[PDB]
């Protein structure tokens, strides 16, 4: 029985960067992946210039699926749920509702686009630290579960054009009245940077999202089958190093996944309001960690408070 | 009024809204090992808080006059301005921390006057 009490007429502000509820989630997740699904290769370069260390263990593979994790607090420690519409991450909340435990959060450790998570408010929501600084990572979440069918991934085109259209209009509302925003191909980097890691039946297919971001939107269609990759050896996302796993049980791997989120990089030129250009990438472990628990804070109390009076009662 | 259902300037109706809430302070292999320990720790903490609540010198609610003089260095409250309206947060933690400093001093003073009179009265 999840408990929740709405707070009326409480103009409570919320910052998705100073939560402190966020602080414990990645610690629980890293400790869990360690006790958990194990690679056959562990690498930790450390100066003990540095000495590359290595830990070898077994790597069994099982069908994996994220389960919802609510976040409960000890005695006291009241948690507050922001439930407004216009939430830009570092913004106030008219509709606040305290909770004893968090909502049905379904997190997924992933790359650029958040998989199987929560939803934004009515189109998408630009919740990043800075909206149009060429120095911060864009933090947006989806509003519709974008179904991606991977066998290579048969990415739909109408839903992709619609999500690009909703995000492009929100970017224009945030910045640029009469502006054209065009999408560019990948930024460059590692496997998980150019391509996208996601839970596909336990495995991680890797499709470069460069054939998806080439849409020119104007202010004034069966399946985009991208080329994915069978995952056996990748850089570890927990820390700095590499991994190695067991071969898949399927040659053509079937999976059903709904992706909900939009975290990507940007060129950063100026190119300010003439045209806006954005590239895929991003999906930090530290930032996805902040992205799940973005509307809360923890406060506690003892039953007290005053009124200075002249009541004078004995004792 | 409500569990955070008002927004106004500070000091009195919070004594009144908390007065109404306090007037109706009651609002009236298989199955289990981890949840029970949390309930035990919660009741241990609550009861430890209650015995510490029990060793106090006020024992009264929302209108209490325990013995520490909220001196003129702290006293600036006009007579009728004491009970009007009160919400206000960063200001509140400082107000609430001030509430507690008077609380510990107050109960220590009533414990001191109760103890002092206890030694001196001696009330036949």
């Amino acid at each position: 029985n999840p408990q929740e009490i709405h707070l009326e007429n409480v103009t409570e502000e919320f910052n998705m960067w100073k939560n402190n509820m966020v602080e414990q989630m990645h610690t629980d997740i890293i400790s869990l992946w360690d006790q958990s699904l194990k690679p056959c290769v562990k690498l930790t370069p450390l100066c003990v210039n540095c000495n590359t260390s290595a830990i070898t263990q077994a790597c069994p593979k099982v069908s994996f699926e994220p389960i919802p994790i609510h976040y409960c607090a000890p005695a006291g420690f009241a948690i507050l749920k922001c439930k407004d519409k216009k939430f830009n991450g570092t913004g106030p909340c008219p509709s606040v509702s305290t909770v004893q435990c968090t909502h049905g959060i379904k997190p997924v450790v992933s790359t650029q686009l958040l998989l199987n998570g929560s939803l934004a408010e009515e189109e998408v929501m630009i919740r990043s630290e800075n909206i149009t600084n060429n120095a911060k990572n864009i933090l947006v979440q989806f509003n519709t579960p974008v179904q991606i069918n991977c066998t290579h991934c048969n990415v739909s085109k109408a839903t992709w054009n619609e999500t690009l259209g909703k995000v492009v209009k929100q970017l224009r509302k945030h910045f640029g009245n009469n502006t054209i925003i065009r999408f560019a191909n990948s930024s460059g980097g590692d496997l998980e940077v150019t391509t996208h890691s996601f839970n596909c039946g336990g495995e991680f297919f890797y499709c470069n999202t460069s054939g998806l971001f080439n849409s020119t939107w104007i202010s004034n269609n069966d399946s985009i089958t991208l080329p994915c990759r069978i995952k056996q050896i990748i850089n570890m996302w927990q820390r700095i190093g590499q991994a190695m796993y067991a071969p898949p049980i399927q040659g053509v791997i079937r999976c059903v996944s709904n992706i909900t989120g939009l975290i990507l990089t940007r060129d950063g030129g100026s190119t300010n309001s003439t045209t806006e250009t954005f590239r895929p990438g991003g999906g930090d472990m530290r930032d996805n960690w902040r992205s799940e628990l973005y509307k809360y804070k923890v406060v506690k109390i003892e039953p007290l408070g005053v009124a200075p009076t002249r009541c004078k009662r004995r004792v | 009024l409500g569990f955070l259902g008002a927004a106004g300037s500070t000091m009195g109706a919070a004594s009144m809204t908390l007065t109404v809430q306090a007037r109706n302070l009651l609002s009236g292999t298989v199955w289990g090992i981890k949840q029970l320990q949390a309930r035990v720790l919660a009741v241990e903490r609550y009861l430890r808080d209650q015995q510490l609540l029990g060793i106090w010198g006020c024992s009264g609610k929302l209108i209490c006059c325990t013995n520490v003089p909220w001196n003129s260095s702290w006293s600036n409250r006009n007579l009728s301005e004491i009970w009007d309206n009160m919400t206000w947060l960063q200001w509140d933690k400082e107000i609430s921390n001030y509430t507690q400093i008077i609380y510990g001093l107050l109960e220590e003073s009533q414990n001191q006057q109760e103890k002092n009179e206890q030694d001196l009265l001696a009330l036949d």
């Epitope: 830009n88 570092t90 | 300037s9 960063q90 200001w91 933690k93």
Partner: nanobody, 131 residues
Framework: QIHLVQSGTEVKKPGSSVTVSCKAY?????????VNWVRQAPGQSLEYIGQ??????????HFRGRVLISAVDLTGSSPPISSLEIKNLTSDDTAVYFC??????????????????????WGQGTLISVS
């Protein structure tokens, strides 16, 4: 690591309006950083005019109906620009204007009282001789 910059030098006619700025480097938004506007008689003390907390155009009763505050929120390519509108600039309105950027998100350490917040940083100071 945070510096505040106000508008430059401005000389207006007697009985006019003013539009001064308050640039805030290293600041995100007025939603998190409310700005309280304070004037200053040239050489004398500083009198609090009003504030723009939570994008609220307001001023004191002494300044009501003559001063309203707008704070154009920009971040990234441009710092948050807090403007100030004071109508009917008489010769008596010769003053040095001031803005103040302080966080509103931190709500349990000591920064604010019913809008009147702790003035941590200040801008340059705009001497305006209405002539």
């Amino acid at each position: 690591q945070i510096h505040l910059v106000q508008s430059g030098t401005e000389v207006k006619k007697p009985g006019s309006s003013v539009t001064v700025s308050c640039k805030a480097y290293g600041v995100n938004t007025f939603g998190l950083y409310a700005v309280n506007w304070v004037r200053q008689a040239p050489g004398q003390s500083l009198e609090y005019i009003g504030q723009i907390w939570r994008w609220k155009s307001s001023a004191s009763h002494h300044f009501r109906g003559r001063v309203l505050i707008s704070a154009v929120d920009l971040t990234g390519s441009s710092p948050p620009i807090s403007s100030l509108e004071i109508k009917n600039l008489t010769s008596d309105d010769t003053a040095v204007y001031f803005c103040t950027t302080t966080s509103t998100y931190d709500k349990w350490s000591g920064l604010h009282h019913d809008g009147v917040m702790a003035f941590s940083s200040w801008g340059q100071g705009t001497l305006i001789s209405v002539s």
